Amino acid sequence: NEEGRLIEKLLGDYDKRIIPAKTLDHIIDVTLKLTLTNLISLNEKEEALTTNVWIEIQWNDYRLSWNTSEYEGIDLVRIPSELLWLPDVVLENNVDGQFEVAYYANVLVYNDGSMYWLPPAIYRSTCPIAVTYFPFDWQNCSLVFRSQTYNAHEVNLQLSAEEGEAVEWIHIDPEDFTENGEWTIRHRPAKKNYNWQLTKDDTDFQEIIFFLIIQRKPLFYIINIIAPCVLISSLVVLVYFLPAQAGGQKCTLSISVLLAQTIFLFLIAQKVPETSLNVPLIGKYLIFVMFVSMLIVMNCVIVLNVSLRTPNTHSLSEKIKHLFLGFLPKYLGACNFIAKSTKEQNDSGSENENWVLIGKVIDKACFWIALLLFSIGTLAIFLTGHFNQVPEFPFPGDPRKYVP
Amino acid sequence: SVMEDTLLSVLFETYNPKVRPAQTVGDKVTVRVGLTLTNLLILNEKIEEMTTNVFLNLAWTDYRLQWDPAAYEGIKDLRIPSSDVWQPDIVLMNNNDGSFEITLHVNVLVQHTGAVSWQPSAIYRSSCTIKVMYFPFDWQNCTMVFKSYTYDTSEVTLQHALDAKGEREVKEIVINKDAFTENGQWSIEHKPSRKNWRSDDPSYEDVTFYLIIQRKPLFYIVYTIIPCILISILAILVFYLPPDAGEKMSLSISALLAVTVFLLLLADKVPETSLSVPIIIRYLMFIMILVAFSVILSVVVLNLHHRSPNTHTMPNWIRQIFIETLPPFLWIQRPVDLKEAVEAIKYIAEQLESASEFDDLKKDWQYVAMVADRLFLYVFFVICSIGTFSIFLDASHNVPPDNPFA
Amino acid sequence: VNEEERLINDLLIVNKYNKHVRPVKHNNEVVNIALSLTLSNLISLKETDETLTSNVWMDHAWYDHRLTWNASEYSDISILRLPPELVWIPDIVLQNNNDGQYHVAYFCNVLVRPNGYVTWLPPAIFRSSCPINVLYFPFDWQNCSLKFTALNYDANEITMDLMTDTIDGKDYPIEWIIIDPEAFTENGEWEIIHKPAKKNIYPDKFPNGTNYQDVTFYLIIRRKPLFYVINFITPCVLISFLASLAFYLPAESGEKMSTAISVLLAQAVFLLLTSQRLPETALAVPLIGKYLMFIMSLVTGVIVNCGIVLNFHFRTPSTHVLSTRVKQIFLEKLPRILHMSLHDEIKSGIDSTNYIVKQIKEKNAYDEEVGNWNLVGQTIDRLSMFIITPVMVLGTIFIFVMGNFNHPPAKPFEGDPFDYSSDHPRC
Amino acid sequence: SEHETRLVANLLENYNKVIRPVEHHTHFVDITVGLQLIQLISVDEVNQIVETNVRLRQQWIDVRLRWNPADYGGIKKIRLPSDDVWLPDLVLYNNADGDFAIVHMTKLLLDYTGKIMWTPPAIFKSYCEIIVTHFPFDQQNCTMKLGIWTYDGTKVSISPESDRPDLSTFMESGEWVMKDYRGWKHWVYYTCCPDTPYLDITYHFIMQRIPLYFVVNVIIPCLLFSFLTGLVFYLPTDSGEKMTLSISVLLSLTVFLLVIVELIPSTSSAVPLIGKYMLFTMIFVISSIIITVVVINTHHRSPSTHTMPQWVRKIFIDTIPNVMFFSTMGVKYIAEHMKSDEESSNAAEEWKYVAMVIDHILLCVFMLICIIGTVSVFAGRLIEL
Amino acid sequence: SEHETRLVANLLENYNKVIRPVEHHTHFVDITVGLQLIQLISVDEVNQIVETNVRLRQQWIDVRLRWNPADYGGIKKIRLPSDDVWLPDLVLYNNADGDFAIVHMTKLLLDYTGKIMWTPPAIFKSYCEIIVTHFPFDQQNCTMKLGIWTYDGTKVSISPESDRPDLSTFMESGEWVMKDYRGWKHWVYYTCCPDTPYLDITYHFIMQRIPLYFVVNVIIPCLLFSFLTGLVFYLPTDSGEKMTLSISVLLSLTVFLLVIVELIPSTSSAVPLIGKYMLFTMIFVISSIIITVVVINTHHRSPSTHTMPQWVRKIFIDTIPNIEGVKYIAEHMKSDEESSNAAEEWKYVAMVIDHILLCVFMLICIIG
Ligand SMILES: *[C@@H]1O[C@H](CO)[C@@H](O)[C@H](O)[C@H]1NC(C)=O
Ligand SMILES: C[N+](C)(C)CCOC(N)=O
Ligand SMILES: C[N+](C)(C)CCOC(N)=O
Hints:
heteropentamer; B: alpha+beta; 12 strands; cell membrane (chain B); membrane (chain B); Neur_channel (chain B)
């Protein structure tokens, strides 16, 4: 095998601790190309994005150059990466301590010194979760690659080119790509970025950022959380048709609705990050419906108080009686002692009937008010959750699309 | 210079740790394998994995590590780094995680006759299949399988470790009286050891150490069984409550909710394997069915109580069964201008008489309801008592065998 | 130039230092390793996992005659710092640990003096396994241990022993865990009552087996229960009082059972939340758990009694008779003891009036019977209250006083009169 | 052994582990790869990961390691550390947790003809997309894709040992049953290297979940609460406690919905049958509660302010024959007042009667709906054959 | 380059990384140490552990690693790997779960004058005793204590780079905001080594929690239930549903108290103000339940067996508000009227008590 002689010739006077600069002031052009195989997950609690990628780092090492005529026309050999100098390209925005790649595959080196390294990696990048429109939200995550050791006077990070066109995207490979399910990739641009707060000798002056703009598919959440929550919260307006005559259990129904809404709030908290910069849209809806339910509990207490008033404890003045009976509903739509006892009980019965009529009028009016309020709130919340789509362009000011 | 340094220099001048110590081609290195359990850490039933702290008492003979103590100032034994000598890859093939080899790698002891003895310590997460029946009154049988990963019967011969004296051979897990802490949840009923062979391939041999451990069922009795017994008592009490007091549902469905909460908070203590249903979960199923039927029969009793002759007419068979047939058995025996004024009194007297007959019919319906309520009370009491007693009796009958069957 | 390079080259290279040989002049001689522990921070004690996670500094001291030099011959080198991978170190390991961490976390350099004295102070994060005694939880004190052993050599080759300090010319063993005031953070949940240290020798074993000697550091730590008291005990007692006084609710209102049932549900909730904050061990039932079991049983009895009262209240003469004994007991005796506070047409009309009066009389008799039943029910309610509330209060007081009286022993060991305190060295 | 010591010294003298074992660089190394599944450690549905304990047996011929047994005392097989010889670099393409390749690096058997037989262990925590449509009565088909990473098919060839992975010593899962398992070999062209095909082998397993645990722990209580919702109509509205039963069952179903949500993945590819059954049951409960409030309102409907229409009287008086059950097929002012009271009482009794009739009709229709709904939801997948 | 190859070969041919980089053993190798926070990964309150991502900048002069650029083709920087030169052993004394020292071992910049700058990253999981007195409005001040752990003041003489750690590239946490941050240098004497002062630097960060998440998830429902506490009194006792409402509110408050307990650590140093307020609300709920039971019993207190006290009928009624033709029915009607009047007086007493309790609750809400 001539590869043995070739490799023992190449790695003879070679050490991996020295950047292969031809002369003084010679910048090594290191170019990157990401390939997303599977968007494994977006863990909201840790605000982490776990992705399976193949990273392609390409450069030139003049020391590892030979003559094919002298080695039976060998123009490509694989050398373990541990035996070669590497540009030390790392993911800067990682949640854990994993900076470099996971596998450290072999490097393909060509006769002219071209170095092609394609290691796979599981990257747990960090990205703040904009939870304002959850679950109808889109997340704008990014992977930032820098050189951990060399600065802009030594290496030159660049995007890969194919036929003069620089690859400005993440290059989803049709052969080995898998959809994530809940997350769909709307945009995937790539861009070289500078800081301008550091001079070009600080190893953080230049970065290469791969942006993943993804959109959550909310059918699962709509079916399993929002729809049950709306259906349960719609029962709080049903309380106004229950009788107030020490039955029907208005308070029990309203309190049970409130408790169910609290359970749904806990369920939401069990799926939403603790970012605390903004309150989730579903969380805002839950708070709104809980407040409405508390107000309806107040209304039930007041109606039970009014409809159970007796002529003893309360006096029904004519100003209130006429107002709540003649105007609003139209807008809304030895026998001597026996006779005295019968009349005195009938008067109390009539007063109780008037009070329950007042209670029913209040029930109708407050039912219409609460129905309108709940419907408007639900429509507003789940219509501003809708009409919230991913921006048409990846970077908003730019007119470029960043697609193959 | 110390004679130990010279002895080490002479001993390892050409020694190669990568070659098996065979005096002649075709010889087998007999490796005695024993186990010393210092602490059975836990037995996680959720992942069916037993983690323990052990010492692996390995012994073999290396003919190259021989010398004459008389020529080295009486050095009869040496303690040398484990990585400088050959060693069998005695690993736990039964490990649940990826850890096969040793954690500690203590120094190996070599005698002047070549007898190498290595006793490295390790933390082993072995894979133990969990028999779900009878939990939490269970008796698990967790095996730890040790063998050379790379050497088969044609190269090494696994044997049982010897005792402190060389004449006796140990066939069981050695538990040091000192440095051993008994687990607060499991008790070691049997700890045998055995050499295992698999037929159809005469190149396989294991040393398997069996831990037959019996669970102490406390923290399960107290925290699940007794509260569920109290809930069952409430479910029985549901029937003695009168239908007129509107709290039969508030008690029965509350008991049902309590049982379901017990289920959902016990779901994180039982294995997810579905070969069978554990005794405690089966008892919870029984209690759920009993309480649900209590709710159904309470609804039936409430429906019977509020029936009226104006709305319902009592069938003949209902009266026959629930008036003069069952109450004897259940001891619920029933104990036993002037012209206008005249017309007014007669009408109200007739209305009172009609109301009295109506009340008599309504009381008949309520009596039927009460008789049915008492019958259901007795039936539920006997059914609950019999079921609970039978379930816990067969749970208590489950004990580990006497002959481990090694 | 620097003389340390020449000194190290002479000590380790010229002399052919072998780090795999005991620092002994000749065999059949022991290398004594002095051992000490310093508790920088008691990180946590997880009862569910039964683990003690502690931050310690583990000091070793010994002699290495090979690492000896003449100070005046090397321009007065007083101390030397050498990496552990270049010199022989005794491998002292924590034998009882839940995770596979036996050695120290960081292998700091070792300090050598011209007489051959070598000292090593590496830090460590140790997760030791100590059983948790939950008998008096949360007013409980735990007794955790850290056992260090030498598994690379037997007692005939190296001899572990406690490090010794010198006060006014007399040397005393440091038989306790050192707590440095400049580096120590109180846990805030556990208070160290006793911190002894012993060198254990097991005569049943042999000196040549590495099971012969141990060095054990004990931490007896008392839990400060204010957090657990405030956040679990007070709400539970307050809720139990509701079931205690549920008897005061009248039977006419259809909410007598509901209060007791809800209190029982709250007690079960507290029980199942407490069960998770303690190990799954069967050695003993927790004090708080036992109290809650007693309270739940009492509340169940209260629910049964309320059901009995309701049954006695709504029974009617149409179905249930009023026996003489029931009256003579409940209507009179118990309330005294408990100090409870024309032509034929007109003839038909007269007969109609007679029937009206007879029906009124029957209704009055029915009303008096149901009133007697209601009074019997109220009497049973008062009796149940006066028999249940005091026993509940007494049980709560007794249980919590017995728990609060649980104090750690004055001495850390039963048979040892000496108190392993830093203020009273034995010398 | 002195003979084996000499042999190992001689073999590992000019041997370079970097270089492939081919005699000529034009040739290729054909590695026979088989995977045996010792144990299915777990199937995490929420994270869509399968943890499996496997042995990745692989055999290949290394010419540089051959020797003559008669020279070295008749030794025909030795064992060498895997770090000393050239090793094929198998990588698990689909991967979520753990390393992509073999990390344990156990010893390997070397035959005197150069036949290396390296069988290292591994734990594959491989990503695999689960179909949650039929939960819990689902079968998951998912794979492990192992391939040579840095070498194309013209320099390193991988070949399956057999048509199916070896499950001779496979521990019974206790939660899944292996309906089928098979490995397929693919020549795939990637965008990196369009002119050379890369070889890989995908071993796919079909695992049918045993549903006994999930059924007992989740499904049975949900059926019980659905039955109770059907029952709630037989309760008389006069006793109260009807709303109590309804809300109790609603809260129970909410808790069980939370429990189920904690189990299944959040993917939206297909709605689980358990999720749609929960939604159906919750809609059932909401409809029961709404029509129950309607029944309660009609029962307590005032006989004075609400005159009973003629059509309701007709319908809910002639419906009873169609249903075969237990239902029925000063001196003057006091008299006048009580006559009016009894007339109003009878008028209210008419409303109570129509409410009872509606309750019976709803009870029948809701029992039928519950039975039909549960059968339609579950028998679709329960009938596998 | 070939010049850099020769330079690296010559620098390390007789270089011993064991020995300190000092010309004379009596001197100290001064080290400038600075911290650069990158992201506050987490603050686990229950375990009191703060996980941060940091970069530890260390600069020192290595005399042996000096060269003349004119000889080696004008080269002035090398960028050597750290595992080849002497490295100061900075140890995080507060470690709670993780490594005490640097484990990444990245490359370091090496100037031609011997100056070395090394900026390794690290994930510090340090111990953080959290003051839980205020919550969820707490302010946490916990430090990172970096020492040298092997040498004393006359050997390495550590020094701080700047008065404050560098936060020029700090990613915003979202859950916490940085109020202040500063590093202090200390000379400490330990029981090990009483005659030699060991140097260290403690960097402390003051983090103010953003309470929006916890406010929404706890305080708002707790405030709703606390407001529902007072609706019991306005609820008539005739309707029932009074004990049900009170008990539901109490159980909700207990559940939220348990949630708060799960959130806060189990330390007994101080009771959280939110926990104290929750306990006080529970006390108020219990008192309201007791008063409600008393009011229910008063409302249902039949006069057939219970007489009406005189002082109650004074205060709560006056001061706080401001032969077959026998007529057997007339006398019983009069007696029933008297009993109904006494029962109505009981109803009025119950209503007055309810209104007084409602006014008390309204005053409490106003003052709160
Ligand atoms: C490469 O080989 C060819 C043919 O042998 C020769 O002409 C050419 O000069 C060689 N180049 C180098 C750089 O060796
Ligand atoms: C095989 N593949 C395409 C997944 C990775 C190839 O990487 C190289 N060529 O080294
Ligand atoms: C001083 N101290 C305790 C922080 C470190 C001690 O380590 C030594 N000097 O060996």
